């Protein structure tokens, strides 16, 4: 029974570490894209103006 119960304890840590790595990698790309998106419009249009 204690073997049976110790099958809902925690995932094999490798998959959790993979999910964490992928999320952490993708966050920085989000940040950079947001920065450039904020940069573009005011500058371009005020250049036109």
């Amino acid at each position: 029974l204690t073997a049976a119960e110790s099958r809902i304890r925690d995932l094999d840590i490798a998959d959790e570490m993979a999910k964490f790595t992928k999320n952490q990698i993708l966050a920085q790309s989000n940040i950079s894209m947001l920065a450039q998106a904020n940069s573009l419009p005011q500058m371009a249009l005020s250049l036109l103006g």
Binding site: I8, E16, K19, F20, N23, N30, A37
Partner: protein
């Protein structure tokens, strides 16, 4: 068409960053605790068994 203060892509990026941050936080909580279910909302059937 160039406008002023109409940065919809900023809103889209903000939303996506929101999901990314929440996912990272949940993964960190799971890894720190070392338990699968935790709380009461991850699974409704494992608690009783």
């Amino acid at each position: 068409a160039m406008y002023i203060n109409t940065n919809v892509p900023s809103l889209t990026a903000q939303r996506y960053l929101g999901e990314t941050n929440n996912a990272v936080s949940k993964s960190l909580e799971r890894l720190s605790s070392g338990l699968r279910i935790n709380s009461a909302s991850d699974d409704a059937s494992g608690l009783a068994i």
